[PDB]
């Protein structure tokens, strides 16, 4: 079926507000994690987060931003970046039935849902709620708030799958290209960062709490004393495009999406099964005739998750030794935004010929032995890379990206 390539990207993350800043951070092994007075004041045990360090004031026109929560703001700015990076102008991507948008968040906007309820219960009631809460807080906010101002006429919806959300968005976009239904699909996602959402993760015991005095050390995938993930916010967007369309306009092509896995554990609600991830990686590799050179693991820095993913990798690859690194040790876990952001990190590694380090491994977990886990920035000519994303509910996604020719 039709071939799908990535012709542009955009990103707003804890480790940079565009792809140049992100690339520099990845090369440096730079942490995006800071101390959060907001989280501490809410009463949480985790006081660290991967925050977007950007003043978004006035970056989006009034009539457009009035509808938006932070997830949509981050995604919109990422999409602006990706459009420019792809070389596309309005006559090409606007009012075009062959151009679509698939982009999601894991949680919508907990902040604005709580704002709405608080305003309704306040002394001014309905008049304090205002008319913009539904578009901010609805699950499809990220797609709705972007498809409308960018004049998208093709597909328009959100995929949501917890921490796999934006990976499934990319995979779905590839399917649209494969089915011949669209020439271009903008795919990715966003996630807000706020105590309203983060405290529920703390109440599960899922967040790091032992390292608040040293925030850059708290996210530490594969370290023996990891104690949960560091929550993060941000956005990302990639331009998924049919190959011949891209070639005909002289597009810059980062990579071909040569594999997409999507599977289900059917087992535990919050812990991975392993065989689900194995099937997902294998699905993404079916028909790919080159080895995986680099694997961006989902690797969130939880006791429960990190090593289960490694065992799955061992089963998939055996004696082959794909280089592995967990960029969340630098970036934190941006939830619904994580998949697209990690796809972008992997594309940058592919495009610029290096492996970003898996940082903060002070004592390697005993069960993480025997794998090529890269802990120092390593220059290398990569050809094929893989990125895993998994989520609560046993949902799994894998993307495989490969240089063209």
């Amino acid at each position: 079926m039709k071939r799908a390539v990535i012709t542009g990207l955009g990103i707003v993350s804890s480790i940079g507000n565009n792809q140049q800043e992100v690339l520099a951070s990845l090369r440096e092994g730079r942490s995006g994690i800071t101390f959060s007075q907001e989280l501490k004041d809410s009463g949480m045990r985790s006081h660290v987060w991967g925050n977007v360090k950007l003043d978004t004031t006035g970056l989006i026109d009034r009539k457009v931003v009035r509808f938006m929560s932070d997830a949509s703001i981050y995604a919109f700015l990422s999409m602006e970046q990706a459009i420019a990076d792809a070389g596309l102008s309005p006559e090409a991507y606007q009012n075009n039935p062959r151009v679509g948008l698939i982009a999601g968040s894991g949680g919508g906007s907990p902040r604005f849902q709580v704002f709405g309820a608080d305003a309704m219960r306040g002394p001014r009631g309905l008049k304090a709620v205002g008319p913009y809460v539904v578009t901010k807080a609805m699950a499809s906010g990220v797609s709705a708030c972007l498809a409308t101002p960018f004049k998208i006429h093709g597909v328009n919806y959100s995929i949501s799958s917890a921490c796999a959300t934006s990976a499934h968005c990319i995979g779905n976009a590839v399917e649209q290209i494969q089915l011949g239904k669209q020439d271009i699909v903008f795919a990715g996602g966003g996630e807000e960062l706020c105590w309203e959402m983060a405290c529920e993760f703390d109440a599960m015991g899922a967040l790091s709490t032992k390292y608040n005095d040293t925030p850059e050390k708290a996210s530490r995938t594969y370290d023996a004393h990891r104690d949960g993930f560091v929550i993060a916010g941000g956005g990302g967007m990639v331009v998924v495009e049919e190959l011949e369309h891209a070639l005909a306009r002289g597009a810059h092509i980062y990579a071909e999406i040569v594999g997409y896995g999507a599977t289900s554990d059917g087992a535990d609600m919050v812990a991975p099964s392993g065989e689900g991830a194995v099937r997902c990686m294998k699905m993404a590799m079916h028909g790919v005739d080159t080895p995986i050179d680099y694997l961006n693991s989902h690797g969130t820095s939880t006791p429960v998750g990190d090593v289960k993913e490694l065992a799955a990798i061992r089963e998939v690859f055996g004696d082959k030794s794909p280089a592995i690194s967990a960029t969340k040790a630098m970036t934190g876990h941006s939830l619904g935004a994580a998949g697209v952001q990690e796809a972008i990190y992997s594309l940058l590694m592919l495009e610029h010929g290096f492996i970003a380090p898996s940082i903060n491994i002070e004592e390697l977990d005993e069960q993480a032995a025997g794998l090529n886990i890269v802990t120092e920035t390593t220059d290398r000519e990569l050809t094929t890379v893989m990125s895993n994303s998994f989520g609560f509910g046993g949902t799994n996604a894998t993307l495989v990206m490969r240089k063209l020719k």
Binding site: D61, R62, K63, R66, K127, G130, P131, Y132
Partner: protein
């Protein structure tokens, strides 16, 4: 600031138009691009700015910059 300046500031910020477009004759809908949601929020923002409560029947008539100025001047 004066009532007129404060009203015009609110209208321009709410509707995303430059102050030079917020002339006293201008209609929110026909001249300044307001939709139905903008109307809700604009009444809300006037109520907050001037610590007043505008009955729906009165608010329905506030369709121009001058109408807003006149109402706020007449209900202090």
């Amino acid at each position: 600031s004066t009532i007129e300046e404060r009203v015009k500031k609110i209208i321009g910020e709410q509707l995303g138009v430059k102050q030079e477009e917020v002339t006293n004759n201008a209609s929110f809908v026909e001249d300044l691009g307001a939709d139905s949601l903008d109307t809700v929020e604009l009444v809300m923002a006037l109520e907050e700015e001037f610590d007043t409560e505008i009955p729906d029947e009165e608010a329905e008539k506030i369709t121009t910059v001058q109408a807003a100025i006149d109402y706020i001047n007449g209900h202090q």
